[PDB]
Design a protein around this nucleic acid. Structure first.
Lengths: 375, 165, 370, 368
DNA sequence: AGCTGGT
DNA sequence: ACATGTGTGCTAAGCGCACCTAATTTCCTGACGGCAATCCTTACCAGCT
């Protein structure tokens, strides 16, 4: 059971992701230039969303000692936590451990209980700390995203041992590619030289780039792995799938949104279930040329319908069924009118869609999978 | 050459509306808009009947588009791998210098038509460093023969020579 | 709690956001060229507006020396010891447009910068009197950016985290149709007959005319955290923003293109998540002989609004909103009626309805906050 | 008799393979830079594919003693196993050893635990390793084994470990100039701080390209190394066809979920294989009409034309196939009407190629 | 009875 | 890739812009894995042809 979500989103003039010099992220798809949003952006926007608070629980941080000190309260505790964590094998150079460490939040309490224990020696305390850190797989964020801890070897106490600290990711996200041929535009900003003085010229001028695009976004969620690394909590797993769907639909990357308030919802979502991941990025190898009798989003949905019906004919007539729940708001744009039978269930409501997918996975209710949370 | 100089001088004569419609045609061929082709024909036809040597048509169109977008001034001795490299010495060699350096080397393995966006980012960081002069004639006659490797290696060695000084 | 504004205007032949060449700004939306009014321009015209001249609490200046001037002569005392903070002088400037308030800043920055008290000991006082305030409405809406240089500033400056998030999200105004640029040829003609019948200077001007769509979103609890518990000034902010988005227009080439026009449609929604109804106008509005451009655009907007309302809603929390047309010439299309909770014909009553949703603050006593 | 399987795959911006520095692999084909995917990565991803699980029966391990110790509840044999292996010829925990999984598991367990010897125990363990040819993944990828001559015994011999590879996967050559793209990523520190900076500013390079993928089956070799049977051979050929059309290299797919599918299949039966790399010696530059996939297919069909007439082999004609789903992408848009059996499915072409292999069907063979 | 593949 | 198909009969000269303007802090990863052989002999000796 692999749940995939294909999203066609039209965005206003925006700069939702950029490189070092400020240009929006571009890719050469099909030999032509297309604007691009990175998968880490949508991944973290899903993670830091307005429905995933009940599903949080991860910190991929470098300042563990601050959290252990905050648990310790007003008991100093910075120096001995620092020396213990340096003794495990996470070296510090300026003030922080020199690698990212990912671990559930609820283990902070017993980690600080190890740290505040003065009866233990040095290698025993560091080994207990490493055991607590390495066996912290209680959150859904580490369930979806993944983990790796490889402690440093030269400046490490010899009597320190680590179990398997690596978890496997249950969420696969692709980079959002522009459906149409993408061109970047040029904007210069100015500053406010509001108080006159004597020059009356310019205070500051510059150069900024932006692009508007219709984006194709991909999400891929496993079920057995997500419930395997969530130790079989099926209510929690169904809650993750549902809240992840709502987050992917209702949230956008927070890149320069204060100046480009591009908060446009998906005008078509294809939610499907089968064993192996399909992909529809090759639907738009030829860029969409806008003619006057049609629209950009309408033609993008039509080309997506052509490719999806195409590979459903060439891929999905087997003994293994493939069932999809096509979503548009209130049926704005249905599928290709030359077929009119591709979608299994023409869904017009996102909440009836989340009820339907929760019913399909094993049979679940949003009000009943909300009752289980990990935080 | 005595033919490309007239082309650059005629380009410097162009007024604001003409290079505005040239600015609007970035990344677009000279067919989908009639006024752009008309402007290019007016700029490109009369210099073949007065001097025997002219640049390539695609080079002229690309250079006109870039000139409209950036609007430098023509000065001898200010080719791309001198000002480039001069700005590379004003950098931290640890992280940013490989970034800008790779941005420059991207040009050396591209055909004429696809260089609009890499030349755009190179001239964008040139504009960020407040560069006014660019030898448009020198750039044009090293670009019209960009397909022979001696001039590419000479351009690269000019970058090396400007970097070591 | 998010307060959203969606507007539809239509201006005369105009040059509002021209190029340095002179060309009005354009962007591509849906593969077709649309006129764009810059988000920075909309925000600045909002800030400098007449009805925003009752809210201002910040200047965001460049060279604070002349503002800290007006014993009666503190300079070269202002600019000279201004270099210690990391803001060097280049033709008596500070080289960084500091995001920074205007009332308490100027009223308590004279006491520590009128010489005395030692250099680099008044640097911490500079940090206190520059990087602390944030109790300005327009600054907290527009955010705050500050940075001291590391090359010239001394190590005695203890700069805290001055990064302050913005409570406002505006989008660039997009025309609802295919933009067309008009090349107005013009000359400059001489009147003295000092020579033969010449003219003078000949050249060109470029302009356009369009029907614009503007989107705003004012965060509520983020704003009340940014102002730290001032409810009435927050109500002043939201109401004055609702008034200033409508009644005020950009100030580009308005001397030669007077296109002051009022929005014929304002839609305000109240959700806990943001949306933008810009995908309605992916198809440009083709004007037909039986209707007008504004009415057709409003009909497409009503189509999209009803559709998104039926598709992304029916929670336990419904979506409530008020629709504004002036004297009801443009109701919400001819489709499904009663979509908006209240169709309001006047602007001040729409503002009052938003304010009554906000928690029950009126419009008159809120202005007594400032 | 040998089978050719050609694909033309366009991919989303992705990094399916990297070198030591992290750049996507590049080759100088035809005087220009072409993006490359390593053959071994494709072979590994097709090995680990979700449809080969009925046929995945090969293990490449140095921890053989760990495999012995796992299947022993209370009989700890891990130092005795280690010294048996250490005088087998491997010298250390060892080098990489290829074998069948279940065979080595059960019967190396029974041949190791008995306290009957230490020298002949290593000799018979080595013979069990060398006779482990009952696996078709070994038959496809190939395996030799060279033990040391220093850390061994003079009484321990090794039989001929000759296993030929029945598969020649080519490296996926891009159909155009490679445009290697630089991705700039940061790592967010979840807890805040004074600096408001990234935990790790890093380097990643990605390349979006239309890859010409090329495989080849030596079916005669596939049955000369898989003994006299043909049922397992037909099952493996069908399994590879499904896997290659269905799976992708497991590179940075968590960061670039490019699971796009092959937009072209060309199966041609002959005794002299051909790659259509010379179909794209001229780099494919797109035009305003059509797309990169269609221009690449057009150049490929032009090459198929002058190697089906200029290099015609009408003694053994082409049985050239397609996967044109309901004829979305035809080959002969101008002249090349030589696609004899253009179809729009995948199981149909699987069944067809095992039909010209011999008297087999898709469903009956799928039980070995 | 010698020969040849191994030590 | 202006010329050349004139076909009662298709003008034209004077005129085309100057200047202020581009900022920074910091952030940058650890470990594990790295192939064996075979390309002249201490040469006779015993498995057996």
């Amino acid at each position: 059971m692999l749940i995939e979500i294909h999203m066609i989103q039209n965005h206003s003039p925006a700069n939702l992701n950029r490189d070092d010099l400020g240009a929006p992220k571009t890719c050469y798809f099909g030999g032509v230039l297309r604007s691009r949003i990175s998968s880490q952006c949508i991944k973290r926007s899903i993670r830091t969303s307005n429905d995933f608070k009940a599903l949080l629980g991860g910190v991929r941080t470098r300042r563990l000692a601050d959290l252990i000190q905050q648990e310790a309260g007003e008991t100093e505790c910075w120096k001995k936590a620092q020396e213990i964590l340096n003794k495990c094998g996470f070296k510090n150079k300026d003030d922080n451990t020199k690698m990212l460490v990912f671990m559930s939040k609820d283990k902070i309490k017993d980690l600080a209980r190890i740290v505040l224990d003065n009866s233990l020696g040095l290698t025993e305390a560091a080994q207990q700390v490493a055991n607590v850190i390495a066996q912290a797989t209680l959150a859904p964020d580490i369930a979806l995203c993944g983990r790796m801890l490889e402690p440093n070897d030269k400046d490490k106490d010899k009597k320190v041992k680590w179990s398997n600290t690596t978890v496997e990711a249950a969420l696969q996200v692709a980079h959002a590619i522009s459906t149409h041929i993408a061109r970047p535009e040029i904007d210069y900003f100015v500053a406010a030289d509001d108080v006159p003085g004597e020059d009356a010229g310019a205070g500051h001028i510059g150069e900024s780039m932006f692009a508007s695009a219709c984006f194709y976004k991909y999400f891929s969620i496993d079920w057995e792995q997500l419930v395997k690394n969530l130790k079989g909590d099926t209510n929690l797993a169904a809650h993750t799938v549902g809240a992840f769907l709502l987050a992917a639909a209702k949230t956008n990357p927070s890149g320069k949104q204060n100046s480009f308030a591009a908060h446009n919802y998906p005008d078509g979502i294809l939610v499907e279930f089968k064993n192996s991941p399909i992909s529809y990025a090759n639907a738009f190898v030829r860029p969409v040329s806008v003619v006057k009798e049609s629209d950009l989003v309408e033609q993008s949905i039509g080309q997506l319908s052509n490719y999806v019906n195409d590979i459903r004919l060439g891929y999905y007539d087997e003994q293994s069924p493939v069932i999809g729940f096509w979503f548009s708001p209130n049926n704005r744009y249905p599928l290709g009118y030359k077929h009119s039978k591709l979608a299994s269930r023409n869904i017009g409501n996102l909440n009836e869609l989340v009820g339907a997918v929760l019913d399909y996975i094993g049979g679940f209710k949003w009000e009943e999978v909300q009752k289980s949370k990990a935080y | 050459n005595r033919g490309t100089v007239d082309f650059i001088a005629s380009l410097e004569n162009l007024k604001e509306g003409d290079l505005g419609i040239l600015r609007k045609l970035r990344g677009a061929r000279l067919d989908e808009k009639l006024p752009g082709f008309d402007l290019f024909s007016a700029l490109w036809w009369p210099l073949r009947q007065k001097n025997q040597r002219a640049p390539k048509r695609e080079v002229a169109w690309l250079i006109a588009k870039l000139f409209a977008e950036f609007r430098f001034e023509q000065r001898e001795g200010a080719t791309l791998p001198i000002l480039m490299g001069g700005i590379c010495r004003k950098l931290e060699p640890k992280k940013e210098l490989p970034r800008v350096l790779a941005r420059f080397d991207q040009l050396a393995s591209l055909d004429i038509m696809q260089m609009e966006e890499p030349l755009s980012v190179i001239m964008g960081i040139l504009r960020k460093h407040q560069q006014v002069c660019l030898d448009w004639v020198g750039l044009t006659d090293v670009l019209s023969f960009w397909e022979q490797e001696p001039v590419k290696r000479e351009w690269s060695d000019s970058f090396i020579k400007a970097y070591k000084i």
